[PDB]
Design a protein around this nucleic acid. Structure first.
Lengths: 151, 152
DNA sequence: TCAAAACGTCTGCAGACGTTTTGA
DNA sequence: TCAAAACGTCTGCAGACGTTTTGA
């Protein structure tokens, strides 16, 4: 587990607080026991001309990668172990995105348990609900009821 | 002329790099000797539901104010001296909006000498030109070139 | 004449989702 | 049956300007 210099984290929290997203999703997918995949994402967006900055993040954070989607580009971190380690350290300095950050951590820690009881999974899916409520969600389909109405 | 923590500035520098605007403008206005106002602005936007965060900031920075625009709110810092002191302290930590910041400090210092001679004033206008170019400028009308003409 | 505030404008996004595949 | 990658796309803005008014 890589440890981050505390100056880097202070700058990074500020950036994330202003122009970063912390995303939790329930993805309909029949090849899963309970028919959905739990998915977590940390994401930063820069215009494609400025992606030199997104590439530095990959170096400095040491994990994740960059995605080009035309006029704009993304830094993406989804791997569950690195994300946990990263949010754990970044969390104390967050002012606007702390709750999402903590809801993500608690979800990750309960992932092995959610793969067992259909009630534990369903309950984890309500945390996912809380994260999207905190964000400015616009185009959202698959929620916990969507799930409860399957089991 | 308040002095800020290194913990505050580092955080703030990240926030500004990510979500902050450094704006410079040449405003046509006939009450001025060279018929234009040189305007500088530091700006941050939030959804009004999260005003408190910008209100908090007014208090920590010690200056500037908050405008509710209906559904979004702006933190706005326009005052030249506070602006200089704020950016002079924040400038070494910026990784994206540093160039803007320097151009803004340059401008603030040459400001009194710019009011003395239309050639120094025109030069200063070529600095706001550069800032606009570093931003994602889309609706700009008054440039140093429209100042050159008018001053003839 | 000036610094600073006040108020107006808009369309190219972009935060935050979506669905499908890869590769175990 | 899973973690992650890859890729598609909507809608309320909001970044970065504009014009106008205030009051020493």
């Amino acid at each position: 587990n890589t440890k981050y210099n505390k100056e880097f984290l202070l700058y990074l929290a500020g950036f994330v607080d202003g122009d970063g997203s912390i995303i939790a999703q329930i993805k309909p997918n029949q090849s899963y026991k309970f028919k959905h995949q739990l998915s977590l994402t940390f994401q930063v967006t820069q215009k494609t001309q400025r992606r030199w900055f997104l590439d530095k993040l990959v170096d400095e954070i040491g994990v994740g990668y960059v995605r080009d989607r035309g006029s704009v580009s993304n830094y993406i971190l989804s791997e569950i172990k690195p994300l946990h380690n990263f949010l754990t350290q970044l969390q104390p300095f967050l002012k606007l995105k702390q709750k999402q950050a903590n809801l993500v951590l608690k979800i990750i820690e309960q992932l092995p348990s959610a793969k067992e009881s259909p009630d534990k999974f369903l309950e984890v899916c309500t945390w996912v609900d809380q994260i999207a409520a905190l964000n400015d969600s616009k185009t959202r389909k698959t929620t916990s009821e969507t799930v409860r109405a399957v089991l």
